[PDB]
Amino acid sequence: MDAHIANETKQQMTRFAPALVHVIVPDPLLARAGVDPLAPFAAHAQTRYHGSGVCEPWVSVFAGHVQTGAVESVLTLPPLQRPRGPGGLFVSLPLALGAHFDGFTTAALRVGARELVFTYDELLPARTRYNVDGERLERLCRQFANYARARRVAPAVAAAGGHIDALLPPAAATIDGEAQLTRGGFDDPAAPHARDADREILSLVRLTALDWLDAGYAALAGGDAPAHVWRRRPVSLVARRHYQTGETFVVVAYEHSTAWGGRRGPRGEPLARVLAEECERHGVEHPRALPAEARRELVRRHAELAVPLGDEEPPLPVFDATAELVLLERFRNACVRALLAGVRESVRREPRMRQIIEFAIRPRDREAVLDVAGRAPALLDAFARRLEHTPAREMVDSGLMTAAAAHLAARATAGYVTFESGPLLGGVFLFDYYSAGGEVIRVTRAPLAVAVEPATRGQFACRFRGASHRCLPGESYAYLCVGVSRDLRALVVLPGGFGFFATLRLEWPAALVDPVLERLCRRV
Amino acid sequence: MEVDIALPTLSPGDLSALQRCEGRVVFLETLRRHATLREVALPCGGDVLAAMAAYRRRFAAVITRVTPHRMLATPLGVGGRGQSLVLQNTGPFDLTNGDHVCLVPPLLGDECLRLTSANLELRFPMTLPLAQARELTARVVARAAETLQLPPPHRDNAEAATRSLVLNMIFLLNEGAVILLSLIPNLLTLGAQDGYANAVIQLGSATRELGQLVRQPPPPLPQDHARRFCVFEALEAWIASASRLGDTLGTRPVARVCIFDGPPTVPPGEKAAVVEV
Amino acid sequence: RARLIRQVTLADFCEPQAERPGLVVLALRHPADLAGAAYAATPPGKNHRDLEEAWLALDRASVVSLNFLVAAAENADDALRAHVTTNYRDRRTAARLERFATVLRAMIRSHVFPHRALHVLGGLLGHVTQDRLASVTCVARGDQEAARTNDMAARRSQVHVPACALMDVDRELRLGGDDGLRFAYLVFVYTQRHRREALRVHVAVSRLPELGDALSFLLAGTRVDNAIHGTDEADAPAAPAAAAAFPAYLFNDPRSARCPTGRLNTPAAEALPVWAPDMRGRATRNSCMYAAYVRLGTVERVVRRALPLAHMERFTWDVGAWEECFF
């Protein structure tokens, strides 16, 4: 919970975003996202508007990953009980809103390697759940009473225990966090007025209660501990789902907090309202197919809905929760088309490939190199099939898209810096291996930074700094070696050292370069 | 270590008066053994602040034996904390036993020693108890700061005094000073329940006026305050500063008095035996 | 006569057979309380356990010779580094010097300054050593040569200071003065820029009893570039609200809203003006700390003569208390 407080203060003091939101991503979500807990964290986040492709520069946020039960750590105090259940990292994302918070505009999170997306329409719930926290708090105070009565620690707390006793029943207590997401119903801002308006008509037809806990409990731990104070003020956690992977995660909001929810937190009407009204009014089934003379009034009203409606073809598909997925899939398709076309052109002419790397082969191994000769064609075919069919989440960390981004970094006309790797310093080929026996699967987790150097009689010499992984190219069997330079010049090294160079021509529009490079670099 | 001050030929009518100076301190620039009298010299009155500042760069020396040839003086404090000696009380006030003394320049420029035998005057300062030297220094620095026995100011080195004051003050504001300030109403409410609480706060204290003319919200939570506490840092800083305020504006206590049997007080123009601290 | 101190300790930092007598030694605090006080002392934004790690990377040992400490700072002439490295008998010594450098650079980063970690003793004269365990003996008051060393070649001694660090002041400030009896001050120089910071040591002599303005002018560049880059990594809020302007026009207003004591909880007293003095991220005093000094004693003369050195003359040991230099 210290993470949320730290992020709220860092936001309010500096104003790195209009508003904020508190989130508790549990264990199984992180697990299915491909990221692992219990490892070093480094959190970042950025907000990417939809239909345009303009990404605010990343902002570092404080995240703290609990281990045991997480939800109860928001509800209970240390000395009285211990939490229980699953546990995930606390985090707070920035927003972009204020008048009519636009839908379908995501908030991208970044953890050590992988990125998660959280569509606004999914993050921000209409109604909160503050009515159940009274039921929770009364049990909590009764709990403290039965503790002070029995443990016999100090007199100042004993007096508070006696007061609480004489205030409300001493029956029994227990706090359960899991029961909070199930039992409750959503609180609306009317029902007190229903009770009040019923009061007049029925009547016609004819210290305080909790600050004792505060003053007392400030003596057991001996410390005020401002992080605690919000645990006595009512909270509200609204269990929600996820669009990217289809699991659960929670969006908490504290009363005193200036985040999204609670009190003194900004509220913006869901932009889907006017969209639904005008979709029904003029009588069409879809907002994109709206008559332009009608869309003129919408664009006239709110300066945000403009670009998803005015241009003929927007840079990114609009009104679909899967924009970034389509973008990454198209980028990967382009990179793979490039590489495969390159090796294709270099092998098209009926070749005889010269071993471009020096490797002395023992005299009993003529059989093995003859076997490599026999299986080269099927090996290349299976390699093409594999490199094609693979998904996109697993490819982005590889060297292919790495050097593709390094290539795009020049023509983009704007500076860009990597996250965790020094610039490539062209001349270094980033390798991605592949098994050479039977089933063909990548073996390397991180790319290998080898450096080619022209040597005797046109046989470039290998040497690699940055990584340390034996059998570098073509040294041992069962390793097909591919690698593309910053200049996008690829080579292929079969076992034994045999292979060829190959050029690469990347064919990709220019109107989308800065989006992709904002999503794969830092732009500082 | 006894310094030697030689003299020129003076008038026999003036050595009889200078010989009567056996407990007033002189201010030398260096501490070589042999020395002259022409070096230690001061003009007549003017700019009490300038001389007060000069009383920190130069170190004192008490004289004990005069001869028409030379003058034997004692380096007051550079390496000794037990040199029990005597210096006469040329101060206006009366100093009892166990009083830390302080050298303050003389006021009004009225009392000096115009030595006509060689055309030079020596302005021996006066010795006051610490408690009154502090109020004197306070009054003078307040009057100097005001201009952006009553002497006039100089306004050439008033900049320096007001400067040191506002520096020692500006570095008293701190992230915890606001937390300590947001309790002024909570203190003033105590100033009515208890009598000593009203006592500790003066009459025109410029805070009991503030206490009713504004309002302030609870202080915003600073950064990392779940780990570090600030009011303690503020208090420690204030102790460290205020422990050294009275020096950088006036003079440090040079020594203290001690007697055995006789009358407690030593009225002015009298010899008093002091230890050195 | 003079009186001495004996402190048995480890041959870690001061190595009394490697140097000859006559050089100042320092006493090092127990590191546990430093590591603890860090937890509450490092400012906001910065790391709050990096001193823990920096110390753990150097594993009682209590004394440290100035001859050793001066080497592990920015300012040093490489001749003295070579001397300390090749002339100390001890194993693994250069590595230890490196780690100590990292320790002190962490100390300034965590706002627990080394001047609050190194009390100064006198100049050592004698020692008996087992295998990696020594018992040094230094003067504490009186003049150095009242002692009696068991060398039998030079019974008495002097005080030796690495001439690379000895910074004179008067001839530096050009006071036009004449050298008589001068004081002696050991001064530290801090500089604060996150992950790019260092410490400078000096030994200063002068007639000035009160350093103050003298260092404030001597180290002008340090104070300048330290006051501005010092508040870094602290989130300051946006432009300060106009309510922060403390109202002064309202003190001697005869007609103004007023409120007697005893009715201040939530009465009909809402009419008082609001003022929120809010100070979050500005330069605190510990942010503008740049130097610290402490008086050592009195001196006649300094001559330079040999590795370069600086022999004192009639040093009288009189140790004083520490001092801050921030304004």
Q: For the residues of B199-263, what is the DSSP string, one character each? A: HHS-SS-SSTTHHHH-B-PPPPP-TTTTT--SHHHHHHHHHHHHTTHHHHHS----EEE--SSS-
Q: Which strands make up the sheet holding B100-104, listed edge to edge?
A: B85-88, B271-275, B255-257, B100-104, B126-129
Q: Which of C215, C324, C294 is nearest to C24 (CA)?
A: C294
Out of B171, B178, B233, closest to residue C327 by CB:
B171
Task: Say if CB A347 and CB A380 are below 8 A apart.
Answer: yes
Tokens of B261: 């049997």
The C-alpha of B222 sits at a distance from chain C's nearest C-alpha, in angstroms, of 6
Rounded Cα distance between C17 and C75, Å, is: 25
The full DSSP string for A159-222 is: HHHHHHHHHS--------SHHHHHH-----SSHHHHHHHHHHHHHHH---SSHHHHHHHHHHSS
Rg (alpha carbons) of chain A, rounded to whole number: 30
Question: How distant, in Å, are the alpha carbons of A148, A156, A210, A221, B2 from that of A145?
Answer: 5, 13, 12, 15, 78
Q: Which of C284, C49, A239 is nearest to B230 (CA)?
A: C284
The full DSSP string for C264-311 is: -SSSS-TTSPB------SS--HHHH--EEEEEEEEES--EE-----EE
Q: Is residue C112 exposed (0-12), middle (13-18) or buried (19+ Cβ within 10 Å)? A: buried
Task: Say if CB C205 and CB C314 are below 8 A apart.
Answer: no
Q: Which of C210, C218, C204 is nearest to B248 (CA)?
A: C210
Rounded Cα distance between A450 and A427, Å, is: 9
Rounded Cα distance between C94 and C85, Å, is: 6
Task: Say if CB A249 and CB A80 are below 8 A apart.
Answer: no
Residue type, A56: E
Out of B220, B223, B226, closest to residue A227 by CB:
B226
Rounded Cα distance between A121 and A100, Å, is: 12
The C-alpha of C228 sits at a distance from chain A's nearest C-alpha, in angstroms, of 18
Residue type, A386: R
Please tell me which residue of chain B has the smallest CA distance to A9. B223
Tokens of A193: 């007025």
Residues 6+ apart with CB under 8 A from B251: B52, B55, B56, B102, B103, B104, B133, B137
The C-alpha of C236 sits at a distance from chain A's nearest C-alpha, in angstroms, of 6
Question: How distant, in Å, are the alpha carbons of A61, B3, B269 from that of B19?
Answer: 80, 17, 14
Please tell me which residue of chain C has the smallest CA distance to B191. C261
Task: Say if CB A331 and CB A325 are below 8 A apart.
Answer: no
Q: Which of A306, A389, A325, A388 is nearest to A519 (CA)?
A: A325
Rg (alpha carbons) of chain C, rounded to whole number: 25
Rounded Cα distance between C295 and C141, Å, is: 13
The C-alpha of B223 sits at a distance from chain A's nearest C-alpha, in angstroms, of 7
Rounded Cα distance between A163 and A217, Å, is: 13
Q: Which of residues 269-308 of C touch B (CB under 8 A)?
A: 272-282, 284-286, 288, 297-298
Q: Which of A187, A48, A65 is nearest to A109 (CA)?
A: A48
Q: Is the dihedral of CA A116, A121, A124, A127 positive or negative?
A: negative
Rounded Cα distance between C141 and C317, Å, is: 5
Report the half-sphere exposure of C303 (CA within 13 A, side-chain side). Answer: 6
The C-alpha of C155 sits at a distance from chain B's nearest C-alpha, in angstroms, of 25
Q: Are strands A89-94 and A64-65 parallel, antiparallel or unpaired?
A: antiparallel
Give chains near A: 3+ CB pairs under 8 A.
B, C
Q: How many CB pairs under 8 A join A and C?
A: 15
Paired strand residues for A106: A48, A119
The full DSSP string for C97-159 is: HHHHHHHHHHHHHTT--GGGTEEEEEEEEEEEEETTEEEEEEE-SEEGGGS--TTSS-SS---
Rounded Cα distance between A90 and A107, Å, is: 16
Please tell me which residue of chain B has the smallest CA distance to C316. B79
Strands (E), A397-465: 428-434, 448-453, 461-464
Contact B213 C208 (CB under 8 A): no
Q: Is the dihedral of CA C201, C206, C211, C213 positive or negative?
A: negative
Q: How many CB pairs under 8 A join A and B?
A: 16
φ, ψ at A337 (rounded to 5°): -60, -45
Between vectors from CA A446 to CA A443 and to CA A450, what angle results, nearest 5°? 95
Rounded Cα distance between B140 and B250, Å, is: 10
Rounded Cα distance between A117 and A323, Å, is: 10
Rounded Cα distance between C227 and C51, Å, is: 23
H or E element that contains A250: strand A248-254
φ, ψ at A485 (rounded to 5°): -85, 170
What secondary structure letter does DSSP report for A494? -
Rounded Cα distance between A64 and A41, Å, is: 8
Contact B223 A13 (CB under 8 A): yes
Rounded Cα distance between C124 and C14, Å, is: 10
Tokens of A229: 């104070």
Report the half-sphere exposure of A283 (CA within 13 A, side-chain side). Answer: 0
The full DSSP string for chain B is: --EEEE-----HHHHHHHTT-SS-EEEESS--SEEETTTS---SS--HHHHHHHHHHSEEEEEEEE-SSEEEEEE-SSS-S---EEEE--SSS-B-SS-EEEEEPPSTT----EETTTTEE----EEEEHHHHHHHHHHHHHHHHH--------SSSHHHHHHHHHHHHHTT--HHHHHHHTTHHHHHHHHHH-HHHHHHS-SS-SSTTHHHH-B-PPPPP-TTTTT--SHHHHHHHHHHHHTTHHHHHS----EEE--SSS-S-B-SS-EEEEE--
Contact C181 B173 (CB under 8 A): no
Count other Cβ atoms within 10 Å, centred on residue A142: 20
Partner B contacted by C207 (CB < 8 A): yes
Residues 6+ apart with CB under 8 A from C126: C16, C21, C136, C137, C149, C150
Q: Which of A268, A269, A287, A289 is nearest to A278 (CA)?
A: A287
Please give the torsion angle defined by the CA atoms of residues A197, A201, A202 and A206, in that order, rounded to the nearest 10 degrees. Answer: 160
Q: Which residues of B touch A9 (CB under 8 A)?
A: 221-223
Residue type, C10: L
The C-alpha of B121 sits at a distance from chain C's nearest C-alpha, in angstroms, of 22
Residues 6+ apart with CB under 8 A from A378: none
Question: How distant, in Å, are the alpha carbons of C47, C52, C99 from that of C57?
Answer: 17, 9, 7
Q: Are strands C303-304 and C291-299 parallel, antiparallel or unpaired?
A: unpaired
Please tell me which residue of chain B has the smallest CA distance to A7. B223
Rounded Cα distance between A126 and A269, Å, is: 9
Report the half-sphere exposure of C317 (CA within 13 A, side-chain side). Answer: 26
Length of chain A in residues, anyone?
524
Contact B223 A2 (CB under 8 A): no
Task: Say if CB C14 and CB C84 are below 8 A apart.
Answer: no
Locate all alpha helices (DSSP H) within A85-131, ordered by sequence.
120-123
Question: How distant, in Å, are the alpha carbons of A3, A200, C213 from that of A195?
Answer: 39, 9, 73
Give the largest Cα separation in chain A, rounded.
112
| 3-class DSSP state of A228 | helix
Rounded Cα distance between A328 and B162, Å, is: 66
Chain A residues with a Cβ under 8 Å from any Cβ in chain B:
2, 5-6, 9-10, 12-13, 225-227
Interface test with A, best of B175, B225, B227 (most A CBs within 10 A): B225
Residue type, A49: Y
Partner B contacted by C259 (CB < 8 A): yes
Q: Which of B113, B98, B90 is nearest to B17 (CA)?
A: B113
Rounded Cα distance between C59 and B3, Å, is: 54
Contact C238 A10 (CB under 8 A): no
Q: Which of C268, C264, C248 is nearest to B188 (CA)?
A: C264
Q: How many CB pairs under 8 A join B and C?
A: 126
